[PDB]
Amino acid sequence: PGEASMLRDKINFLNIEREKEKNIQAVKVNELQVKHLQELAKLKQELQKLEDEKKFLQMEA
C-alpha cells in the first residue's frame, strides 16, 4: 500500500508542476510581446517623423 501512496503524491506534484510551468511560459511570451510592441512603436514613430520631414521638403516648391 505504501509504494502506491508515494506514487499518488508524485502524480499530484507533477499536476501542479505542469500548471506552474505553463505560467512561466506565459510570462516569457508576455515579455517577448511587450518588447516587440515597444520596438515596433519606436520604429513607427521614426517613420512618421521622416514622412512629415519629406512632406515638408516636397512642400518647398
Calpha distance 58→52 (Å, rounded): 10
Calpha distance 13→21 (Å, rounded): 12
Residues near its own copies (CB under 8 A), total: 29
Q: Answer yes or no whether residue 12 interacts with its own copies by CB under 8 A.
A: no
Residue whose grid cell is 512642400: 59
Q: Amino acid identity, residue 35?
A: K
Q: Of the candidates 31, 34, 38, 51, which one interacts with its own copies according to CB under 8 A? A: 51
Contact positions toward its own copies, by CB under 8 A? 3-4, 7-8, 10-11, 14, 17-18, 21, 25, 28-29, 32-33, 36, 39-40, 43-44, 46-47, 50-51, 53-54, 57-58, 60
